[PDB]
Design a protein around this nucleic acid. Structure first.
Lengths: 47, 260, 53
DNA sequence: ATGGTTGGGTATAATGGGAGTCGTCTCGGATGCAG
DNA sequence: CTGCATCCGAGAGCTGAGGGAACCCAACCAT
Protein backbone atom coordinates (compact mmCIF):
# COMPACT_ATOMS: atom_id res chain seq x y z
CA UNK A 1 0.00 0.00 0.00
CA UNK A 2 3.05 2.31 0.03
CA UNK A 3 3.25 3.08 3.76
CA UNK A 4 6.01 2.13 6.19
CA UNK A 5 5.96 -1.10 8.20
CA UNK A 6 4.45 -0.92 11.72
CA UNK A 7 6.13 -1.61 15.05
CA UNK A 8 6.92 -5.26 15.85
CA UNK A 9 5.32 -7.52 18.44
CA UNK A 10 6.25 -10.61 20.48
CA UNK A 11 7.50 -13.42 18.19
CA UNK A 12 5.56 -16.67 18.16
CA UNK A 13 8.65 -18.66 19.17
CA UNK A 14 8.61 -16.96 22.58
CA UNK A 15 4.97 -17.99 22.99
CA UNK A 16 6.02 -21.56 22.16
CA UNK A 17 8.81 -21.28 24.73
CA UNK A 18 6.40 -20.04 27.41
CA UNK A 19 3.93 -22.83 26.61
CA UNK A 20 6.66 -25.48 26.80
CA UNK A 21 8.07 -24.07 30.05
CA UNK A 22 4.64 -24.10 31.69
CA UNK A 23 4.21 -27.72 30.57
CA UNK A 24 7.19 -28.56 32.82
CA UNK A 25 5.22 -27.19 35.81
CA UNK A 26 7.14 -23.90 35.78
CA UNK A 27 5.22 -20.62 36.02
CA UNK A 28 6.74 -18.13 33.57
CA UNK A 29 5.00 -14.76 33.78
CA UNK A 30 5.75 -11.50 31.96
CA UNK A 31 5.55 -8.39 34.15
CA UNK A 32 5.57 -4.67 33.41
CA UNK A 33 7.46 -1.97 35.32
CA UNK A 34 4.90 -2.00 38.16
CA UNK A 35 5.19 -5.78 38.79
CA UNK A 36 1.74 -6.43 37.39
CA UNK A 37 1.00 -9.38 35.08
CA UNK A 38 1.01 -8.66 31.35
CA UNK A 39 -1.02 -11.07 29.21
CA UNK A 40 0.90 -11.67 25.98
CA UNK A 41 -1.67 -14.15 24.64
CA UNK A 42 -4.45 -11.57 24.08
CA UNK A 43 -6.84 -13.25 26.52
CA UNK A 44 -6.90 -16.46 24.47
CA UNK A 45 -5.50 -18.72 27.22
CA UNK A 46 -7.26 -17.44 30.37
CA UNK A 47 -10.29 -19.31 31.70
CA UNK B 1 18.97 -50.07 41.87
CA UNK B 2 18.00 -49.77 38.19
CA UNK B 3 16.43 -52.49 36.01
CA UNK B 4 12.95 -52.65 37.61
CA UNK B 5 12.39 -56.11 36.09
CA UNK B 6 14.99 -57.60 38.43
CA UNK B 7 13.44 -55.82 41.43
CA UNK B 8 9.96 -57.08 40.54
CA UNK B 9 11.18 -60.64 39.99
CA UNK B 10 13.07 -60.67 43.29
CA UNK B 11 10.02 -59.34 45.15
CA UNK B 12 7.85 -62.00 43.49
CA UNK B 13 10.39 -64.67 44.43
CA UNK B 14 10.33 -63.63 48.08
CA UNK B 15 6.75 -64.96 48.31
CA UNK B 16 6.57 -68.78 48.54
CA UNK B 17 4.11 -70.80 46.50
CA UNK B 18 1.40 -73.15 47.78
CA UNK B 19 0.95 -76.91 47.85
CA UNK B 20 -2.23 -78.77 46.88
CA UNK B 21 -3.50 -78.69 50.47
CA UNK B 22 -2.82 -74.95 50.66
CA UNK B 23 -4.50 -74.30 47.30
CA UNK B 24 -7.67 -76.22 48.17
CA UNK B 25 -7.75 -74.61 51.64
CA UNK B 26 -7.45 -71.09 50.23
CA UNK B 27 -10.04 -71.71 47.50
CA UNK B 28 -12.49 -73.13 50.04
CA UNK B 29 -11.92 -70.14 52.33
CA UNK B 30 -12.60 -67.80 49.41
CA UNK B 31 -15.83 -69.61 48.55
CA UNK B 32 -17.15 -69.54 52.10
CA UNK B 33 -16.10 -65.90 52.39
CA UNK B 34 -18.17 -64.86 49.40
CA UNK B 35 -21.08 -66.97 50.67
CA UNK B 36 -20.78 -65.29 54.09
CA UNK B 37 -20.67 -61.88 52.39
CA UNK B 38 -23.94 -62.69 50.65
CA UNK B 39 -25.48 -64.00 53.88
CA UNK B 40 -24.50 -60.84 55.77
CA UNK B 41 -25.90 -58.75 52.91
CA UNK B 42 -29.22 -60.57 53.23
CA UNK B 43 -29.18 -60.31 57.04
CA UNK B 44 -28.58 -56.56 57.13
CA UNK B 45 -30.64 -55.83 54.01
CA UNK B 46 -27.99 -53.63 52.38
CA UNK B 47 -26.46 -53.56 48.91
CA UNK B 48 -23.67 -56.19 48.66
CA UNK B 49 -21.06 -53.94 47.05
CA UNK B 50 -21.07 -51.50 49.98
CA UNK B 51 -20.51 -54.23 52.58
CA UNK B 52 -17.78 -55.58 50.30
CA UNK B 53 -16.15 -52.15 50.40
CA UNK B 54 -16.38 -52.15 54.20
CA UNK B 55 -14.73 -55.57 54.44
CA UNK B 56 -11.99 -54.51 52.00
CA UNK B 57 -11.31 -51.39 54.07
CA UNK B 58 -11.07 -53.46 57.25
CA UNK B 59 -8.60 -55.96 55.75
CA UNK B 60 -6.46 -53.25 54.16
CA UNK B 61 -6.47 -51.29 57.42
CA UNK B 62 -5.92 -47.62 58.16
CA UNK B 63 -2.70 -47.87 56.12
CA UNK B 64 -4.80 -47.80 52.94
CA UNK B 65 -6.36 -44.33 52.83
CA UNK B 66 -15.02 -44.15 51.15
CA UNK B 67 -13.88 -42.47 54.37
CA UNK B 68 -13.06 -43.70 57.90
CA UNK B 69 -16.31 -42.44 59.45
CA UNK B 70 -18.70 -44.35 57.16
CA UNK B 71 -16.77 -47.63 57.26
CA UNK B 72 -16.42 -47.43 61.05
CA UNK B 73 -20.11 -46.63 61.50
CA UNK B 74 -21.23 -49.58 59.40
CA UNK B 75 -18.61 -51.83 61.04
CA UNK B 76 -20.24 -51.19 64.40
CA UNK B 77 -23.68 -51.30 62.75
CA UNK B 78 -22.86 -54.95 62.00
CA UNK B 79 -21.43 -55.73 65.45
CA UNK B 80 -24.98 -55.02 66.68
CA UNK B 81 -26.16 -58.19 64.92
CA UNK B 82 -26.57 -61.07 67.40
CA UNK B 83 -24.20 -63.99 67.80
CA UNK B 84 -24.40 -67.21 65.69
CA UNK B 85 -25.09 -64.87 62.76
CA UNK B 86 -21.69 -63.22 63.34
CA UNK B 87 -19.33 -66.06 62.34
CA UNK B 88 -20.00 -65.07 58.73
CA UNK B 89 -18.19 -61.75 59.26
CA UNK B 90 -15.05 -63.50 60.52
CA UNK B 91 -15.32 -65.89 57.58
CA UNK B 92 -15.51 -62.98 55.14
CA UNK B 93 -12.45 -61.36 56.74
CA UNK B 94 -10.57 -64.66 56.50
CA UNK B 95 -11.67 -65.12 52.89
CA UNK B 96 -10.44 -61.66 51.91
CA UNK B 97 -7.09 -62.40 53.53
CA UNK B 98 -7.07 -65.75 51.70
CA UNK B 99 -7.62 -63.93 48.42
CA UNK B 100 -4.59 -61.77 49.22
CA UNK B 101 -2.36 -64.80 49.88
CA UNK B 102 -3.66 -66.67 46.82
CA UNK B 103 -2.99 -63.73 44.50
CA UNK B 104 0.49 -63.09 45.91
CA UNK B 105 1.40 -66.77 45.65
CA UNK B 106 0.01 -67.22 42.13
CA UNK B 107 1.53 -64.03 40.69
CA UNK B 108 4.24 -66.19 39.09
CA UNK B 109 1.76 -67.59 36.56
CA UNK B 110 1.58 -64.05 35.17
CA UNK B 111 5.32 -63.81 34.49
CA UNK B 112 5.50 -67.38 33.18
CA UNK B 113 2.74 -66.76 30.63
CA UNK B 114 3.75 -63.18 29.77
CA UNK B 115 7.43 -63.85 29.10
CA UNK B 116 6.45 -65.20 25.65
CA UNK B 117 4.45 -62.11 24.62
CA UNK B 118 7.27 -59.57 24.26
CA UNK B 119 7.74 -57.67 21.02
CA UNK B 120 4.10 -56.83 20.23
CA UNK B 121 4.27 -53.09 20.97
CA UNK B 122 3.81 -53.48 24.74
CA UNK B 123 6.68 -53.71 27.20
CA UNK B 124 7.05 -56.70 29.52
CA UNK B 125 5.88 -54.88 32.65
CA UNK B 126 2.58 -53.74 31.11
CA UNK B 127 1.92 -57.31 30.00
CA UNK B 128 2.63 -58.53 33.53
CA UNK B 129 0.35 -55.98 35.18
CA UNK B 130 -2.51 -56.78 32.81
CA UNK B 131 -1.94 -60.43 33.61
CA UNK B 132 -2.32 -59.66 37.31
CA UNK B 133 -5.63 -58.00 36.42
CA UNK B 134 -6.75 -61.17 34.69
CA UNK B 135 -5.50 -63.16 37.68
CA UNK B 136 -7.66 -61.17 40.09
CA UNK B 137 -10.67 -61.78 37.84
CA UNK B 138 -9.87 -65.50 37.69
CA UNK B 139 -9.44 -65.70 41.47
CA UNK B 140 -12.76 -63.94 42.08
CA UNK B 141 -14.66 -66.17 39.64
CA UNK B 142 -12.96 -69.48 40.51
CA UNK B 143 -15.18 -72.39 41.68
CA UNK B 144 -13.23 -75.10 43.53
CA UNK B 145 -16.13 -77.59 43.48
CA UNK B 146 -14.91 -78.85 40.09
CA UNK B 147 -11.69 -80.08 41.79
CA UNK B 148 -9.70 -78.55 38.91
CA UNK B 149 -6.34 -76.93 39.56
CA UNK B 150 -6.15 -73.14 39.67
CA UNK B 151 -3.68 -72.99 36.76
CA UNK B 152 -6.29 -74.36 34.34
CA UNK B 153 -8.84 -71.63 35.08
CA UNK B 154 -6.24 -68.89 35.49
CA UNK B 155 -4.40 -69.40 32.19
CA UNK B 156 -7.47 -68.61 30.07
CA UNK B 157 -8.15 -65.37 31.94
CA UNK B 158 -4.47 -64.41 31.72
CA UNK B 159 -4.35 -64.94 27.96
CA UNK B 160 -7.61 -63.04 27.47
CA UNK B 161 -6.37 -60.10 29.53
CA UNK B 162 -2.99 -59.96 27.78
CA UNK B 163 -4.58 -60.20 24.33
CA UNK B 164 -7.13 -57.48 25.09
CA UNK B 165 -4.34 -55.25 26.41
CA UNK B 166 -2.37 -55.88 23.21
CA UNK B 167 -5.37 -54.96 21.08
CA UNK B 168 -6.11 -51.82 23.11
CA UNK B 169 -2.64 -50.40 23.83
CA UNK B 170 -0.24 -51.58 21.10
CA UNK B 171 -1.13 -48.87 18.56
CA UNK B 172 -1.15 -45.08 18.83
CA UNK B 173 -4.39 -44.84 16.84
CA UNK B 174 -6.91 -47.07 18.59
CA UNK B 175 -8.48 -49.68 16.32
CA UNK B 176 -11.30 -51.91 17.64
CA UNK B 177 -10.46 -55.42 18.81
CA UNK B 178 -12.38 -57.11 15.98
CA UNK B 179 -10.57 -55.12 13.29
CA UNK B 180 -7.23 -55.80 15.00
CA UNK B 181 -8.04 -59.51 14.86
CA UNK B 182 -8.99 -59.10 11.19
CA UNK B 183 -5.60 -57.48 10.52
CA UNK B 184 -4.01 -60.36 12.43
CA UNK B 185 -5.76 -62.87 10.17
CA UNK B 186 -4.69 -60.90 7.09
CA UNK B 187 -1.05 -60.88 8.18
CA UNK B 188 -0.93 -64.59 9.02
CA UNK B 189 -2.65 -65.49 5.74
CA UNK B 190 -0.22 -63.32 3.79
CA UNK B 191 2.86 -64.82 5.42
CA UNK B 192 1.59 -68.38 4.97
CA UNK B 193 0.80 -67.72 1.28
CA UNK B 194 4.28 -66.15 0.82
CA UNK B 195 5.95 -69.16 2.48
CA UNK B 196 4.12 -71.72 0.35
CA UNK B 197 4.28 -69.89 -3.00
CA UNK B 198 7.84 -68.54 -2.51
CA UNK B 199 7.32 -64.82 -3.22
CA UNK B 200 5.30 -61.85 -2.01
CA UNK B 201 1.61 -62.55 -2.72
CA UNK B 202 -0.78 -60.23 -4.50
CA UNK B 203 -3.91 -58.83 -2.87
CA UNK B 204 -6.23 -60.99 -4.98
CA UNK B 205 -4.63 -64.24 -3.83
CA UNK B 206 -4.97 -63.29 -0.16
CA UNK B 207 -8.59 -62.26 -0.73
CA UNK B 208 -9.32 -65.57 -2.47
CA UNK B 209 -7.67 -67.47 0.39
CA UNK B 210 -9.72 -65.66 3.04
CA UNK B 211 -13.06 -66.76 1.58
CA UNK B 212 -16.45 -65.21 0.85
CA UNK B 213 -16.90 -61.50 1.48
CA UNK B 214 -13.28 -60.54 0.72
CA UNK B 215 -12.03 -58.77 -2.41
CA UNK B 216 -8.77 -57.07 -3.33
CA UNK B 217 -10.22 -53.60 -2.71
CA UNK B 218 -11.18 -54.36 0.88
CA UNK B 219 -7.75 -55.92 1.44
CA UNK B 220 -6.05 -52.72 0.23
CA UNK B 221 -8.23 -50.64 2.55
CA UNK B 222 -7.47 -52.95 5.48
CA UNK B 223 -3.72 -52.64 4.88
CA UNK B 224 -4.20 -48.88 4.52
CA UNK B 225 -5.96 -48.50 7.88
CA UNK B 226 -3.30 -50.60 9.64
CA UNK B 227 -0.64 -47.92 9.12
CA UNK B 228 1.04 -46.23 12.09
CA UNK B 229 2.22 -42.59 12.23
CA UNK B 230 5.91 -41.89 11.82
CA UNK B 231 8.15 -39.72 13.99
CA UNK B 232 8.73 -36.06 13.14
CA UNK B 233 12.36 -36.37 14.28
CA UNK B 234 13.54 -39.11 11.90
CA UNK B 235 17.21 -38.33 11.13
CA UNK B 236 17.78 -37.44 7.47
CA UNK B 237 21.23 -37.47 5.91
CA UNK B 238 24.56 -38.37 7.47
CA UNK B 239 24.78 -35.52 9.98
CA UNK B 240 22.46 -35.43 13.00
CA UNK B 241 20.90 -32.08 12.12
CA UNK B 242 18.04 -32.67 9.62
CA UNK B 243 14.66 -34.00 10.75
CA UNK B 244 11.58 -35.03 8.79
CA UNK B 245 9.24 -32.56 10.49
CA UNK B 246 11.47 -29.67 9.42
CA UNK B 247 10.14 -30.22 5.87
CA UNK B 248 6.41 -30.04 6.68
CA UNK B 249 4.61 -26.81 5.64
CA UNK B 250 1.48 -25.28 7.13
CA UNK B 251 -1.48 -25.40 4.75
CA UNK B 252 -4.09 -24.13 7.25
CA UNK B 253 -3.19 -20.56 8.22
CA UNK B 254 -3.61 -17.90 5.50
CA UNK B 255 -0.44 -16.66 3.85
CA UNK B 256 0.62 -12.99 4.10
CA UNK B 257 -0.42 -12.46 0.47
CA UNK B 258 -3.87 -13.93 1.13
CA UNK B 259 -4.40 -11.78 4.24
CA UNK B 260 -3.42 -8.63 2.34
CA UNK C 1 16.68 -21.75 59.47
CA UNK C 2 17.36 -21.18 63.16
CA UNK C 3 18.93 -24.65 63.43
CA UNK C 4 21.34 -23.96 60.57
CA UNK C 5 22.10 -20.47 61.91
CA UNK C 6 23.11 -22.16 65.17
CA UNK C 7 25.12 -24.70 63.16
CA UNK C 8 26.98 -21.82 61.47
CA UNK C 9 28.98 -21.43 64.72
CA UNK C 10 30.72 -24.80 64.46
CA UNK C 11 34.54 -24.78 64.43
CA UNK C 12 34.42 -27.41 61.67
CA UNK C 13 34.82 -25.91 58.19
CA UNK C 14 33.21 -28.85 56.35
CA UNK C 15 30.17 -28.72 58.64
CA UNK C 16 29.93 -24.97 58.06
CA UNK C 17 30.07 -25.47 54.28
CA UNK C 18 27.37 -28.15 54.34
CA UNK C 19 25.13 -26.03 56.58
CA UNK C 20 25.66 -23.05 54.27
CA UNK C 21 24.69 -25.18 51.27
CA UNK C 22 21.48 -26.22 53.04
CA UNK C 23 20.80 -22.62 54.07
CA UNK C 24 21.11 -21.42 50.47
CA UNK C 25 18.12 -23.51 49.35
CA UNK C 26 16.20 -22.92 52.60
CA UNK C 27 16.53 -19.14 52.24
CA UNK C 28 15.68 -19.28 48.53
CA UNK C 29 12.44 -21.06 49.43
CA UNK C 30 11.70 -18.61 52.25
CA UNK C 31 12.33 -15.53 50.09
CA UNK C 32 10.50 -16.72 46.97
CA UNK C 33 7.44 -17.85 48.93
CA UNK C 34 7.36 -21.18 47.09
CA UNK C 35 6.22 -24.23 49.02
CA UNK C 36 8.53 -27.27 48.98
CA UNK C 37 5.58 -29.61 48.39
CA UNK C 38 5.10 -27.96 44.98
CA UNK C 39 8.23 -29.87 43.90
CA UNK C 40 6.01 -32.98 44.07
CA UNK C 41 3.54 -33.23 41.19
CA UNK C 42 -0.10 -34.15 41.74
CA UNK C 43 -1.52 -33.00 38.38
CA UNK C 44 0.72 -33.11 35.30
CA UNK C 45 0.07 -30.40 32.67
CA UNK C 46 -0.52 -31.39 29.05
CA UNK C 47 0.99 -29.32 26.24
CA UNK C 48 -1.38 -27.87 23.63
CA UNK C 49 -1.83 -30.21 20.65
CA UNK C 50 -0.60 -27.77 17.99
CA UNK C 51 2.88 -27.90 19.55
CA UNK C 52 2.81 -31.72 19.40
CA UNK C 53 1.04 -32.03 16.06
C1' DA D 1 -33.24 -49.29 9.68
C1' DT D 2 -28.44 -50.61 9.51
C1' DG D 3 -22.99 -52.26 10.99
C1' DG D 4 -19.79 -51.42 13.53
C1' DT D 5 -18.79 -51.45 18.08
C1' DT D 6 -18.23 -53.25 23.39
C1' DG D 7 -17.87 -56.16 26.80
C1' DG D 8 -17.63 -61.36 28.44
C1' DG D 9 -16.28 -66.23 28.02
C1' DT D 10 -13.50 -70.43 26.88
C1' DA D 11 -11.96 -76.08 32.97
C1' DT D 12 -5.63 -81.79 31.86
C1' DA D 13 -1.86 -78.71 33.50
C1' DA D 14 0.51 -74.81 32.61
C1' DT D 15 4.30 -70.98 38.60
C1' DG D 16 11.82 -65.69 38.61
C1' DG D 17 13.42 -62.55 31.55
C1' DG D 18 16.70 -61.41 28.74
C1' DA D 19 20.40 -58.18 26.02
C1' DG D 20 24.84 -56.95 26.48
C1' DT D 21 30.11 -52.46 24.72
C1' DC D 22 33.72 -50.92 24.77
C1' DG D 23 39.87 -45.31 20.10
C1' DT D 24 37.58 -38.41 24.91
C1' DC D 25 38.33 -34.55 28.05
C1' DT D 26 37.19 -31.72 31.82
C1' DC D 27 34.71 -30.39 36.18
C1' DG D 28 32.60 -30.97 40.67
C1' DG D 29 30.86 -33.45 44.29
C1' DA D 30 31.68 -38.12 47.18
C1' DT D 31 34.47 -41.66 50.15
C1' DG D 32 38.24 -43.30 52.29
C1' DC D 33 43.17 -42.78 53.68
C1' DA D 34 47.09 -40.47 56.57
C1' DG D 35 47.85 -36.84 60.11
C1' DC E 1 38.82 -31.92 62.56
C1' DT E 2 42.20 -30.82 58.55
C1' DG E 3 44.21 -32.22 54.47
C1' DC E 4 45.09 -35.03 50.80
C1' DA E 5 43.55 -37.85 47.08
C1' DT E 6 41.78 -40.59 44.08
C1' DC E 7 36.95 -42.13 42.23
C1' DC E 8 32.61 -41.67 39.41
C1' DG E 9 29.21 -39.48 36.91
C1' DA E 10 27.64 -35.54 33.97
C1' DG E 11 27.95 -32.82 30.11
C1' DA E 12 30.25 -30.54 26.11
C1' DG E 13 33.21 -30.37 21.52
C1' DC E 14 32.38 -24.22 13.89
C1' DT E 15 28.78 -22.33 10.20
C1' DG E 16 26.24 -22.94 5.89
C1' DA E 17 24.43 -25.56 1.36
C1' DG E 18 22.40 -30.21 0.59
C1' DG E 19 20.96 -34.77 2.86
C1' DG E 20 15.18 -39.00 2.58
C1' DA E 21 2.11 -63.71 16.78
C1' DA E 22 -6.86 -66.45 18.95
C1' DC E 23 -11.62 -67.66 18.43
C1' DC E 24 -15.98 -67.27 19.77
C1' DC E 25 -20.44 -65.01 21.57
C1' DA E 26 -23.99 -61.98 22.20
C1' DA E 27 -25.53 -57.57 23.54
C1' DC E 28 -25.50 -52.41 22.26
C1' DC E 29 -25.55 -47.72 20.47
C1' DA E 30 -24.56 -43.58 16.14
C1' DT E 31 -26.69 -42.46 12.58
Amino acid sequence: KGEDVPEPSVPESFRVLVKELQALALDVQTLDEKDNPVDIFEGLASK
Amino acid sequence: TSDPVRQYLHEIGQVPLLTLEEEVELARKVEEGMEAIKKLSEITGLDPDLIREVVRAKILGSARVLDPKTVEEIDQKLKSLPKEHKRYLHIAREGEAARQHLIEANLRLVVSIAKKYTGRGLSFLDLIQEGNQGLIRAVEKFEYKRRFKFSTYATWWIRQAINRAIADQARTIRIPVHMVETINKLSRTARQLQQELGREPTYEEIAEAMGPGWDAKRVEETLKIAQEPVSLETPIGDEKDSFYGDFIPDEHLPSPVDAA
Amino acid sequence: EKELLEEMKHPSRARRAKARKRLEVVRAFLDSGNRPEWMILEAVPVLPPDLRP
